[PDB]
Amino acid sequence: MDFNLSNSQSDIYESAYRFACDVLDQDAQTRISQKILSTELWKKAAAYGFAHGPVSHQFGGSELGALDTALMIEALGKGSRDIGLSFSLCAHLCACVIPLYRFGSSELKDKYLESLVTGKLIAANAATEPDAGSDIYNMQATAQPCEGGYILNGKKIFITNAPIADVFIIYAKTNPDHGFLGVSAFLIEKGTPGLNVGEVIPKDCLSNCPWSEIVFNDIFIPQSQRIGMEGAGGAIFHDSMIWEKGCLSALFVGGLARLLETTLEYAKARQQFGKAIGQFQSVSNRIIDMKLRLEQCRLMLYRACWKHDQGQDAEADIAMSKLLISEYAVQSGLDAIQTFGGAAMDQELGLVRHLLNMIPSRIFSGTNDIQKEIIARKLGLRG
Amino acid sequence: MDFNLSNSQSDIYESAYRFACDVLDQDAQTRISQKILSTELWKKAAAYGFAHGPVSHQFGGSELGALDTALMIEALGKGSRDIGLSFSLCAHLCACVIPLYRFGSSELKDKYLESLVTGKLIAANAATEPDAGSDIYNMQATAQPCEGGYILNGKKIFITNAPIADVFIIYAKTNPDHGFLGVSAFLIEKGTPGLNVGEVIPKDCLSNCPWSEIVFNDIFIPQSQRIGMEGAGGAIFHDSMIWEKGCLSALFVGGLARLLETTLEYAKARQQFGKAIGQFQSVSNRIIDMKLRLEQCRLMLYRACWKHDQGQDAEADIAMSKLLISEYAVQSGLDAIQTFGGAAMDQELGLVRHLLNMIPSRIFSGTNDIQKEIIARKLGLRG
Amino acid sequence: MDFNLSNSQSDIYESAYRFACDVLDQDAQTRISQKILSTELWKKAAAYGFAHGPVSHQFGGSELGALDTALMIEALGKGSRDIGLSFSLCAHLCACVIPLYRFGSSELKDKYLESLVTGKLIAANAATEPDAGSDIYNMQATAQPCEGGYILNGKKIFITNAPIADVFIIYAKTNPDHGFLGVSAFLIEKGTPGLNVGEVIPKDCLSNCPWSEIVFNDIFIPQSQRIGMEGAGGAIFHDSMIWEKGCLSALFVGGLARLLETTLEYAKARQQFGKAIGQFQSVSNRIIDMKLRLEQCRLMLYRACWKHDQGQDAEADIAMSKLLISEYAVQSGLDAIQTFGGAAMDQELGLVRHLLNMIPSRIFSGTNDIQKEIIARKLGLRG
Amino acid sequence: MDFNLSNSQSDIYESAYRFACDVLDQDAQTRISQKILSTELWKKAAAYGFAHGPVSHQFGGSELGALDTALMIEALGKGSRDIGLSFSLCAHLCACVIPLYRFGSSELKDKYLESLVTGKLIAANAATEPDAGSDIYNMQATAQPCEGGYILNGKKIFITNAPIADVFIIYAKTNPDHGFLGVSAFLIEKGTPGLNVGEVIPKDCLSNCPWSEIVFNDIFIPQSQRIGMEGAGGAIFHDSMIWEKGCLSALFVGGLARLLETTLEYAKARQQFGKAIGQFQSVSNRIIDMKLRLEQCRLMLYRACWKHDQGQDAEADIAMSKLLISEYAVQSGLDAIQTFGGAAMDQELGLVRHLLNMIPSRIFSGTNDIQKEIIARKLGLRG
Ligand SMILES: Cc1cc2nc3c(=O)[nH]c(=O)nc-3n(C[C@H](O)[C@H](O)[C@H](O)COP(=O)(O)OP(=O)(O)OC[C@H]3O[C@@H](n4cnc5c(N)ncnc54)[C@H](O)[C@@H]3O)c2cc1C
Ligand SMILES: Cc1cc2nc3c(=O)[nH]c(=O)nc-3n(C[C@H](O)[C@H](O)[C@H](O)COP(=O)(O)OP(=O)(O)OC[C@H]3O[C@@H](n4cnc5c(N)ncnc54)[C@H](O)[C@@H]3O)c2cc1C
Ligand SMILES: Cc1cc2nc3c(=O)[nH]c(=O)nc-3n(C[C@H](O)[C@H](O)[C@H](O)COP(=O)(O)OP(=O)(O)OC[C@H]3O[C@@H](n4cnc5c(N)ncnc54)[C@H](O)[C@@H]3O)c2cc1C
Ligand SMILES: Cc1cc2nc3c(=O)[nH]c(=O)nc-3n(C[C@H](O)[C@H](O)[C@H](O)COP(=O)(O)OP(=O)(O)OC[C@H]3O[C@@H](n4cnc5c(N)ncnc54)[C@H](O)[C@@H]3O)c2cc1C
Ligand SMILES: [Cl-]
Ligand SMILES: [Cl-]
């Protein structure tokens, strides 16, 4: 048992933190105010290494493990206020780069993977539908096999990066049943006939991270664009969620570390009744809760990633981490606001915007109720 | 013991609800989107009766008790999405109209009170300072007595309605000590030399309800503009907070009643896994919490107002109501968002904006930690 | 709307409180220490009126409504430390006296009801089985119709008062289906051939309130011992639970009122660090929670009972009250213990025994998860 | 970073677990029922190694680090139902053996330490007084220096093991001020003139772990019985609490691991409504909370002990662990009871007794409010 980072891991974290502070956080307030996702800045961050993860050197990646990748993303979360951009970049990595690397043919990787790893192409992951969110195997988009490939029809919604993506990793039914083997994955390029990408739909949470719906009207998918085997898509989707749920969630751990530091500084500096407000137990009790949450969920995250790196079954640990991080991030957001009082209603300081940005952490990649269904199944309660 | 409204009270509630739906809620989405406070619409609502409260018929009021006034404001909260406007109107009523009615001289009431009651003049309440929020008796603005009145200097912050107000109810020190008798209240008109009203400072919560800072640079206050006796201001401020804390908080009870209805409708209609999502206990358990909260805090509010109407000491009951309503409003906001999942990130439906609008309820008129200090004192724990 | 008791209700409460303090609470510590249920003392309390409730004067009752009955039981809970005895007496009233009064034939009432009302006979309610607790319609005891009545077989468990009861109100299947109409109710006397009443089974919660299992080995039930019509038993059981869940739960409201007074007195008197421990916000924040809980659940209880008295549908209100009272009673038990620190480990003061006595409130008459299923159904979430 | 135990640590844990199951847990139910602390069995466990900890081989110890010692005690907590005995043995180790080893003179260690390490003498730690619990530096017992040593007077309360102890580690004032340097520690033998050990005072929590008060009436303490330097006692007390708070708290982590296994087995086996009760989300959501708590507080405990072993400052980490473990142990106790329903009221299964045994974990060695004061001070909020 050892609770230190390796020297390599300390360097990865500190380098990522410096990049997030010195490059991404510069001029963040203007981009946030204007709801701008700068794709030039996104591509710099991708190329710096935030789009690399476990990808091999052959395709321009860094062969990072899960703990290394989570540490990099934790630094990003602590160092940059522009969490919309960071969420966009990490969704591309965890839900698009990594599945293509893990399941795509040599031909598909040779054509697209280095471009996705190095900041040349942006990808979006398209699985959720109007009638298939938590119940993702109810998806109704169909990739009907035909001569030469598939005919694709359907509608996908809530698709992060769709308005800016060059390629789409799309999940659709290649068989009528709701089984583990009815879903397949495909890579489709922007501009393919019949791919209709909707306009950006604004939101108040992660408000500069673009999403939209996409509609497939009789798209022809060439056989060679299928990712993995026929029917693998349920398993490919599942695997990609595991990566997203652990590593991507590290963003909110780093965000909580930044929030706690900001909150402690204010509670020491702001005086009422002749003393720092942190001297009143109502105030310090909440801040202590924020610190307890941060230490607990960080350790759970690190252990989940470490278990994956060891080749152990980490499915329940990752679901537990996802759940704790997101619940703790939202509640600590509210606790920080309450520490600042009326001063929390300053848009520049951004405490309310920070809370808005944490609200979706309990929803993306599977809600926290679905995390508990996963844990319940692993505990043997769904027999 | 009786838990029915009177017929008079049912009529007051239903008339207020119809006005909020048929007048104020029309075109609310455009005003919300554009961050517009329509003063023409505000004045219609004031004149309809939302600026009347307990004021006598002599000054154009309706002689409502606290329970009647709270019921009217509950209807406003349920019926209109434009809670920024409603908060603006109720702050004018509870913190400006009512103290002037209760403490001002016949001369001051004759000059200003009917105008404030009937939608002709807008008022702002100015007590909080940079170094005096919870510790309001630390306020440093000084009204130094002189020949003919007072010389006023100081700075007030977080002042609801200041950018649109015609008159300001201002609290300042007329004596150096932090005692119950060091503070006095004054009415000052917009345009008085030395009154410098700051520009609107935007916020994400209650985002169309304007606030700003105001600065006093050697304002001369004529003696006849003092509200109540010299030193009454601590007691006048306290009394106005009691009215604000009970009646004004009813807005968030009505808002919770609307939110619960919206949430129940969705949980019955949205299906996943072959059934309505309300059939899963994770989902229904949260909605039941929202319903438990609504019923409990509504009863506590009604009893607090009823006690006031009976002439009983309601101070602790009002602090308890303020605390429960605001905590429950925020947590139910988060519960509704979690019920809708990704669909909660629709700006038109407004579930995230609703949460933003509830966040300040735990802060205005005294934070919830200060409510617990008040209750602790009434329980004998501050002896 | 009115939050005062009537003069009649104030007298009922104060008379019950005096009886609980001056008769039942005397020598309670010895009976508690020795795990004694004094049936002589029980019968005095029954005859005083705690076994009367809504029963008509014809059978020696007081024709109390639900709110009156709940107030009497609240006083009992506040005034007597011997909550095991009080629970025993209220179970007899709410689950045995009242169903017999509401559903039994003139012949059955004439034979047994005045004796049960006036402290002459003790009754036990026997519905729960090893395979039928929350799922009460799965009960497997069978009352097979035959010439002259029924042949009864089965086993009932968790039966309050069975070791001391003279008569048993028993629920059993008269038809094979799990429907609303498969269950019937019967009154059976102690000593009937084939009625095998088990020995008292000790417990640490409500430890002097006796319970045991009972077994039916081919009991012959005469036709005239059926309570209500054939198949009414599901509805009779349901109705009796409504009475038990509202009125009987008042015991724990009165117990919380006593606990809060004890806790406030200690927090004012116990000094550390040069002041009363109630002056520290960690301490006063918990006590304030106890007070918030007490006021909220008392109002919910009173409204539920008042709605019943008005002839309105009170089913959801009663389930909400049951849930709030019991959750609040347990958590306030823990909060009081934490206020006293090591001093809470005094058996005479009884703070730990009080917590033990509250633990079963979340279980009897339907667990709190079943209360939420009931509320969910009334909210339309079980369609 | 590594989350595996070493092979040595796995052996320590498994050996301790086997001893707790195969020796201490045998016949535990009889001892629990009879409120028996078997000193013969206690001494076997001490000699097995539970009284060794970090003590050197010179005095018969095992030179364990904090993580090793915490693992041994975690196994004890999981393997033996007789947590009263385990608490007694661990209090002797952490608050008496370890301070004597760390601070006592060669002469005092040579005379007493091997006997305490090996199961020959039992010790009690006596610091708390009627007016000095959380405010331990208010203690009023005085050790007035005189020719040859000290004259001791005072009263100590809540003293674990006092009715069975052969020696007492006693803290008293050697100087009038409440400073870090006013308190000294002394070892006093049973039977010393003027040492009046009270009779066992029963309690419902940890009910077979004996405690009592002790009174000093003009005891003469020889100079050579002082432990450490004059005035070290504040620092010796503090150090002993650090050991007690981390390692001793591991008992409740192991107890939670056992409780969760018992609870999962029941939730899989008990059926209602045609399925295992674990299939209902109200039920599985609570069990998942128990599992989340166990994993989080175990990791926090291990890291606190590891930090100590690394020579790092672990004071805040230990206070956080103490707080989380004890809060989680109590709440999981209530969650297990609610999972079992009426079946939790079985004394043999012991779910209610388990809860009683966890209640004091939030109080011993400093309440959880004092843990938050410690963390607040380490966070810089008490400047
Ligand atoms: C910021 C963000 C980015 C996203 N990016 C993408 C993307 O890039 N690609 C993509 O394909 N999708 C994306 N999604 C969609 C996300 O996958 C869905 O929002 C998620 O699967 C939940 O589905 P839903 O929103 O339809 O909620 P629903 O499934 O309708 O859930 C509604 C409520 O019902 C509860 N519920 C549903 N089923 C159960 C059950 N069995 N048991 C208990 N409770 C249940 C839910 O927990 C929730 O409380 C994104 C979502 C967000 C918030
Ligand atoms: C929507 C809104 C509208 C407002 N409108 C007006 C207006 O119209 N006129 C006007 O004069 N003011 C107005 N205010 C200001 C409001 O009165 C102050 O925000 C409030 O008094 C709290 O003061 P503060 O913001 O400086 O917080 P602070 O007092 O700095 O509180 C910061 C934190 O310290 C805690 N704290 C402070 N003292 C204690 C203590 N003794 N014990 C425990 N905790 C403590 C607080 O609870 C809070 O968590 C408005 C505020 C809001 C949010
Ligand atoms: C003090 C006390 C006195 C009692 N007196 C009597 C008496 O006099 N007469 C009599 O007949 N009975 C009596 N009972 C029994 C009581 O009725 C049962 O304990 C109660 O019905 C719960 O059943 P159970 O204990 O078998 O729990 P179970 O039904 O086994 O419940 C176990 C767990 O599963 C949960 N669960 C079960 N079904 C669901 C579901 N659909 N959804 C979500 N969660 C679920 C439960 O909430 C609980 O958490 C008494 C019980 C107590 C504690
Ligand atoms: C099982 C058990 C075994 C024990 N064994 C020993 C032993 O062997 N030797 C020995 O010397 N002692 C022993 N103790 C005593 C223990 O040290 C004291 O119980 C503990 O120090 C708390 O003191 P107290 O009980 O007087 O509570 P108090 O100090 O009176 O606390 C009462 C309440 O006030 C709160 N409070 C007090 N001060 C503050 C503050 N500044 N800020 C916020 N809240 C505050 C407390 O948190 C608590 O909620 C034992 C206690 C227990 C439960
Ligand atoms: Cl405090
Ligand atoms: Cl469910």
Side-chain angles (χ1 to χ4, degrees), chain D residues 113-139:
Chain D
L113 182 57
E114 185 173 12
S115 285
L116 292 169
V117 170
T118 59
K120 302 201 183 60
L121 296 171
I122 298 179
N125 159 230
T128 302
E129 306 196 0
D131 299 320
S134 300
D135 183 6
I136 187 61
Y137 286 96
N138 191 50
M139 63 174 74

Side-chain angles (χ1 to χ4, degrees), chain A residues 270 273 286 338-339 342, chain B residues 125 127-128 133-134 158 160 367 369, chain C residues 281:
Chain A
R270 170 58 169 179
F273 301 97
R286 281 192 298 264
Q338 205 54 14
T339 304
Chain B
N125 159 230
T128 302
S134 300
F158 303 145
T160 293
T367 67
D369 304 315
Chain C
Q281 287 173 1

Side-chain angles (χ1 to χ4, degrees), chain A residues 87 125-128 133-134 157-160 206 211 360 363-367 369-370 373, chain B residues 270 272-273 277 280 282-283 286 338-343 345, chain D residues 281:
Chain A
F87 186 85
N125 159 230
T128 302
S134 300
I157 60 173
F158 303 145
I159 303 311
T160 293
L206 302 170
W211 71 358
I363 301 166
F364 85 94
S365 292
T367 67
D369 304 315
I370 268 53
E373 290 302 290
Chain B
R270 170 58 169 179
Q272 288 290 270
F273 301 97
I277 51 174
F280 295 108
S282 289
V283 171
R286 281 192 298 264
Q338 205 54 14
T339 304
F340 280 70
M345 262 113 265
Chain D
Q281 287 173 1

Side-chain angles (χ1 to χ4, degrees), chain A residues 1 4 295-296 303 328, chain D residues 1 4 295-296 303 328:
Chain A
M1 183 140 286
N4 282 325
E295 298 310 315
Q296 287 176 100
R303 177 165 83 174
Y328 289 167
Chain D
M1 183 140 286
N4 282 325
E295 298 310 315
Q296 287 176 100
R303 177 165 83 174
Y328 289 167

Side-chain angles (χ1 to χ4, degrees), chain C residues 130-372:
Chain C
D131 299 320
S134 300
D135 183 6
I136 187 61
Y137 286 96
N138 191 50
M139 63 174 74
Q140 301 288 305
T142 52
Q144 162 175 319
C146 62
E147 278 184 348
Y150 304 85
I151 296 304
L152 172 74
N153 282 282
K155 176 178 190 171
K156 301 298 198 186
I157 60 173
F158 303 145
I159 303 311
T160 293
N161 291 330
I164 60 169
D166 301 294
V167 299
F168 293 84
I169 308 301
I170 286 155
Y171 295 85
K173 300 306 289 306
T174 42
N175 222 271
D177 65 82
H178 285 23
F180 193 60
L181 291 175
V183 176
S184 296
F186 308 89
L187 190 157
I188 290 190
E189 301 184 1
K190 179 188 174 191
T192 300
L195 177 68
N196 291 310
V197 177
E199 298 278 84
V200 179
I201 306 297
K203 45 172 186 285
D204 292 318
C205 310
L206 302 170
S207 64
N208 70 349
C209 183
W211 71 358
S212 62
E213 73 190 28
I214 64 185
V215 172
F216 316 136
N217 300 118
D218 287 314
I219 296 179
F220 176 72
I221 308 174
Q223 187 64 53
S224 62
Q225 304 298 134
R226 185 182 72 211
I227 294 159
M229 322 187 313
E230 190 105 333
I236 290 168
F237 184 64
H238 200 245
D239 201 70
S240 77
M241 297 268 101
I242 297 310
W243 277 93
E244 192 172 343
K245 281 194 301 183
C247 296
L248 192 156
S249 294
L251 285 173
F252 308 112
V253 176
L256 178 54
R258 178 198 183 92
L259 182 71
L260 181 57
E261 288 174 14
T262 291
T263 299
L264 284 161
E265 285 181 9
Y266 190 74
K268 289 169 193 176
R270 170 58 169 179
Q271 286 193 226
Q272 288 290 270
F273 301 97
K275 63 193 79 193
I277 51 174
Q279 301 256 18
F280 295 108
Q281 287 173 1
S282 289
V283 171
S284 60
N285 283 166
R286 281 192 298 264
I287 295 168
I288 286 157
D289 282 343
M290 298 169 69
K291 172 67 168 173
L292 291 168
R293 293 172 190 138
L294 172 66
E295 298 310 315
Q296 287 176 100
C297 69
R298 181 147 50 208
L299 289 170
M300 294 286 287
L301 170 65
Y302 289 170
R303 177 165 83 174
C305 294
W306 179 88
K307 282 180 164 194
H308 170 95
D309 289 342
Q310 296 285 122
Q312 299 181 20
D313 173 23
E315 184 173 3
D317 308 82
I318 289 157
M320 294 186 286
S321 287
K322 174 74 172 67
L323 167 57
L324 294 171
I325 284 166
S326 57
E327 298 291 352
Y328 289 167
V330 170
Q331 164 78 7
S332 299
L334 291 169
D335 287 350
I337 285 166
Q338 205 54 14
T339 304
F340 280 70
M345 262 113 265
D346 160 39
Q347 283 176 337
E348 189 69 20
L349 165 59
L351 298 176
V352 175
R353 188 172 46 256
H354 173 73
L355 170 66
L356 293 170
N357 291 334
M358 303 302 102
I359 281 166
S361 64
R362 303 193 303 174
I363 301 166
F364 85 94
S365 292
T367 67
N368 283 346
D369 304 315
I370 268 53
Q371 300 321 308
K372 277 206 179 184

